[PDB]
């Protein structure tokens, strides 16, 4: 044997990965050494790899290349085989690249409810699937518009796992969200996931159909079952339509536009609902047909006759039938060793046809046999190989070209025969080794040997007594296992058995590309390469377990989880509905192998390895010297170099080895935890959700530091209740009216039982059953029993009615079997709250008063007047004690008030006070991290739904691009930017918004004209004069100055000119009449440090104020006096709370320090603003409330007192019962509220101690006057005026004609508050009809309250209409009320009444 080296290196060298390799010396008798130098292109980074050699045996080697700066480097590789006999070297190019960590993701479901929160696990690991601890630089969530909702800074996921809570908002816009995680090495990974309010379908079709159909067939089996919510179909009469479509159906746009077809109808009664056998003789066609369609019209009779016309287009023609497919054909045939062809016969639908005799096209060597199919439609066969160049293979099943009219299309009516042509391997020594491939996927763990066939043909002349033979397995881009096996031959050896065994483990990639080879003393090397598929197995075999079939209320459910010792598991508990929605993301189990980039090495991927052209020995292309001129032109062979190339790695050979020739339902997510295996497993208690009807599918994966990844199974933990029933009660109800309670129990157990129902009476209501008997009724398996009560409420407020139901034990009645004890759950008790509203609308008044004992005693007397229209027992006098001034608003920021926050401004009052209160807590350093976390959550919610108001230009209008308004309003942009100023310090409000909104409203500027407005100013009433270009300019300056920004910035530099010039001109212009402008100017001067003009503004504002009980109160210039005869009503003014709050805040904002005189004036302003502040934290005027609450926040910032520990509150009624309270430092923020039921003013509280105490006093009472004075007009009617038709009881149109009388009151944006008569859910689509009509933008409805967002009033009357639906027959006596009022000042209200049309 002449000297010859051989070394294999995987041409996917990864930076951090230790590149395992192999070396070998073949027939050199002198001991030498080898060196592998890795020189770098465009520079010099040489990684030498020098090591020993063995004359006949190989050995493994591993090395790790340095972290290359370049992303993907195509760097030269040279191996220096140092030998005293001869020196051997070879240069080549290999491709190295930085190996980014594998980061798969979660968020269990890709589709959400609006009001839910995201759970968001992220996991990282390297090529080996054990997790790695890396600092991830960037993770963020993206909306359809590309805006960044949230963001997390550089974190380190310990153990390869770290969760991320993230909430959503009430109405997030729904195109599509996506999760993008950016790795530390550039490339980012994505995960789509959407949110939407899906559908509430009352019943759906579930039909099985032949999704594809034979060209020559008669019958189709079609079953039609309509399941409504759970699988108790209770269906009616269906009329199913099978409409076929011919070729170019409806394309002939003349005399016809339809496709001929036929329809059916049928009855449905039980689980076996409707089984429609479908004849097919007049069906689509045997010629000129494209694709039929399947549409079903399910309809029920005993209930609502709504028809669900469903389109299930799962229907495709299959003109080609009985297709033959190659499932295992040996792609490269060998002359001497037969290759084993294995074909598959199968019907066009997909089922194999057993026992079918086929005919094999042996295109060469004439293999013509009448083989037959197996039970699986399988045929196996071999062909003897003594041939020349190449053999072709084909099947024979039909031979036919039938009667069909046109042969223009490809062969369709017959079976498209399967063709294949194998190519001959380049055998330089007339010899080779063949390896038998495998078709079925290789099982892990269980070892499986593969047979090898060899031939020598006398090539191994020198080789004797030892035929060393080697195998190499390539997976995941690298060599995994090496090994050898011997042969004992001194002959020329033909076909034989050379079985080798490979232990299949999880370490192998999903693809298992396996090569074998044998070195010959002649210098050549023979071998083979085979591919395998491996079932996805992971190094961890996890277990998930429960106590299944548990009761629905049974909280206790132990989750035993066993995995690799001391690993970290990611529990994922969710219902089956989510799995039904969509196949999970790789199931988190299956295609995690697919996640690995470049999983299979097809061979030198990338054009950069175009170095194989080295010799081009085909320069002697002259024809072979012979009698016949036969030139060698093409060699469609596969050399051993080509085989090793197809393996995908560089091969280095001393001798010739290359060929010389060249040139749906409800999600309700569940348990989401991170448990740790206690070296043997872990049990986990899991509280089952009181949502019985769904099946819970549990899956989880675990990861250990040394062990790989894991997956167990998909456990289920189904819960079923035999006596479960759903109550049917109105959401709201009238105290005067009474209703008919209805309750039906649903049996879900096969046991034939008899449940007994019983109601639990309370002193708040009386209940009388509609039936006289009280015995349990005969309700057998899968039956429902309807029971009812005549219920009249007595006490107002919230009442949580409860009803218990259970089957009485050991009672022998109707059922032949009476198993009254099915399971642990027998007593079925459910609770549903009920709202009892008294007669008439509630008037809300506030009598809060700030009293400071200041080391002494203070007292106050409460007076309560009841107007004669007050209904009986409507008064609810609640008094709360708050140490802090802004306490109530601290507790209930979200439900701050009525006004459910539809447009931009109200969303911003939902948003900003959270910022201001949190800043106040940060200043006072009692941050109390749990309330801070609550503030974070609600504030991050509030940042969402502002994007609903962002259009492309960057302006946040009241409605934005939504509903087709390409309008930009500068005021709201300024407000939202002012809020986002301090918002960014907490929740990372994306810089893109503050930069783009700053680019806008700044390009919109004229030199001395300072930010001219395009959108209309709101509530012109607050500003009696025109006052344009002054109010809004002054406001926008302070808004964009609140963000960190000084006079040096160009916009304010050009702006302050306008403010000073405007103040100088107004100094000589109109005498006063611009107090709002002056207050804005006062605050602007306070911000800019222009005290030398600020104090001059303040001195004028002092006289322009109105003083009352040592509490200075600025007053509205036009002096509106709408209220008459009511001292309660003066809590409305919306303009008097700005100029006062603005001058307060300007007083407070002293750049050096708030001076003592400033605090003295602040006390006098705070007294009035607190006495004007509505309870429940309301302070009716809304954006007005934002500004005033920020003013109070800045007041409390400078008016802090940590020494106010001792304080005693002794509130005493003038009658019998008194109450006591204490507010120290830690209770300064804790709300202390009690109920004080007494209609008259019989209350007098005494406060002692140290410091200041805020006493909040409010009460609500119900009245209903008529024919009063209203600046609006409320013309509500019904359809009909009086109902006579029975169908008019359920649904009826309601007229909403609203007009506006006094345009000088300048009320612009107003809403109508529409309440239902105790039993009506309004039709959402009939109200959704409104928005296309002008002056009606958004019409959300919630909890019997229909709200219409009237954009702007008019002298003309605007009529609105919609339709409601009756659910509970609640008709004794109540004329329900409807309200209308303006957003930005609440004193204009035109309460009138519309009665139920049938009562």
Curated annotation (Swiss-Prot):
Effect in UniProt of substituting residue 903 to Y: Probably interferes with the activity
Subcellular location as annotated: Secreted
Matches recorded under CDD domains: A2M_2
Crosslinked positions (Isoglutamyl cysteine thioester (Cys-Gln)): 903-906
Pfam families: A2M, A2M_BRD, A2M_recep, MG2, MG3, MG4, TED_complement
Annotated disulfide bonds: 22-60, 225-273, 243-261, 444-537, 569-702, 616-663, 752-780, 778-814, 852-1252, 1010-1058, 1283-1398
Keyword terms of this UniProt record: Bait region, Disulfide bond, Glycoprotein, Isopeptide bond, Protease inhibitor, Secreted, Serine protease inhibitor, Signal, Thioester bond
Glycan-linked positions: 29, 44, 221, 370, 384, 800, 922, 1355
Cellular component per GO, a single term: collagen-containing extracellular matrix
Free-text tissue specificity from the UniProt record: Secreted in plasma.
Gene Ontology molecular function, alphabetical: calcium-dependent protein binding; endopeptidase inhibitor activity; enzyme binding; growth factor binding; interleukin-1 binding; interleukin-8 binding; protease binding; serine-type endopeptidase inhibitor activity
GO biological process, any: stem cell differentiation
InterPro entries on file: A-macroglobulin_rcpt-bd, A-macroglobulin_rcpt-bd_sf, A2M/Complement_sys, A2M_N_BRD, A2M_TED, Alpha-macroglob_thiol-ester_cl, Alpha-macroglobulin_TED, Ig-like_fold
Function as written in the Swiss-Prot or TrEMBL entry: Is able to inhibit all four classes of proteinases by a unique 'trapping' mechanism. This protein has a peptide stretch, called the 'bait region' which contains specific cleavage sites for different proteinases. When a proteinase cleaves the bait region, a conformational change is induced in the protein which traps the proteinase. The entrapped enzyme remains active against low molecular weight substrates (activity against high molecular weight substrates is greatly reduced).
Binding partners and assembly: Homotetramer; disulfide-linked.
Family the entry assigns: Belongs to the protease inhibitor I39 (alpha-2-macroglobulin) family.
PANTHER family: ALPHA-2-MACROGLOBULIN, MACROGLOBULIN / COMPLEMENT
Protein name (record): Alpha-2-macroglobulin
Organism whose genome encodes this protein: Homo sapiens
Classification of source organism: Eukaryota, Metazoa, Chordata, Craniata, Vertebrata
Underlying gene: A2M
